């Protein structure tokens, strides 16, 4: 609770009187979070004064109804974040799952629950794609919640009620545009490939090798010769990169495209 | 630790060989930050059958050291940037304090330590803007570290040390451009304005409704009727906001330059 991790922060003899003041704003809105905030302001250690002065700061907030209102919403807004940031990287943990689950064979001839699983990730990113323009990404976060029995996602507040149609409709037909294309270029799927199609990850290596220095070099030169940009990298490394994404997006959309018809 | 961390996501049966297998991994890498990221998923029960999903997950990380690697590190990434957050918020806390303590009348006959303050806080958003660009915010978190008792802040790593040397002069430069402009403009410069000079604060705000009334309709037509926009609102308001922000900066610029000869 709060009157416990506010004493925290003070010397013996004031520890006892200051736990017993802060004991009247236990339900006071945000003292839940506030708390969690003092323990979390805690561990930065990495000192000696310091201490006395989060001590006297929190000496004024005993005083002040308006300034601990304030102090406790401010510290509230960071904790609510920190809470989105959490929920985020849970997802960022299944990325790794997946990986990793992958990699072990889990889905060396179920295809089917990865391509799932695949979709799922997709939908996310699309959803990524949702709030980085909306201009407090708690928004993307806000979507998923919602469309998690629409879209299938095992992970009013927010926007518009009729904000949910759009997005929807969108990942619907960016799921059709892309997906396929993004698929060949996944980590997981990647991963199965070398365990299963081993002799055929020999093939579209090799086409690799033979593409960067047979067409790489003479494709980025005729594009910078066109451009008019046939010097300085920010012009070569620039056009370059793109060339090797593009190589790859081939490539492995083929690859992929060959191994899915066997199944 | 980590060993009560996991085991909390388990049933009574599972509890206490669960607790027993993960105390073997207490002393690996980033197992002190991973710990605190259970406790912190451990709040969102805003739910059953969720729980079974984390522990199942959570078996599997006890398997694999090389999974288990990955994501300690992952939700380590996350921890090292919740801290950062932290620190910033107590930047935002004291700008809470400020703004509290100046309309408490700290500050009155003291405008000396107000100002001396003002120079902190102006100094730490030009440290703001020196890392919205280098494009991950920990680099301000680093940059407010280091130049802490070269440019007097009360709150290698990250770059370069030549770095510091462009930042620190490009604040002592922008220092002498903005800041008494920005100070003109500020919050708990504003708390002592209304409690001290009451009187010449009744001066400036019916300056803004002489100049609202009066110059800003006509001043934003012309304004219009010159760029060619005389229509549809995104040109309207746009241009109108700005004016405001001008007007405002003008008469606050000249009125903290009339009570600061006074002192």
Known sequence: SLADAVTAWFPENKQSDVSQIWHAFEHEEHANTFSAFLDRLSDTVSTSGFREQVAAWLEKLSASAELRQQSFAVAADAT????????????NLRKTLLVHQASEGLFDNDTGALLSLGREMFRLEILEDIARDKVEIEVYLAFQTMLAEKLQLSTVSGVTANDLRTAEAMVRSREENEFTDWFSLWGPWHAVLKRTEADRWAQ???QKYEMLENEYPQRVADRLKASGLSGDADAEREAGAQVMRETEQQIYRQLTDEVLALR
Chains 1, 2 share one sequence.
């Not at 609510?80 to 997802?91: F, G, Y």
């Open 80 to 91: 609510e974040s920190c809470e989105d940031r959490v929920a985020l990287t849970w997802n």
């Open 204 to 206: 579209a290596e090799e």
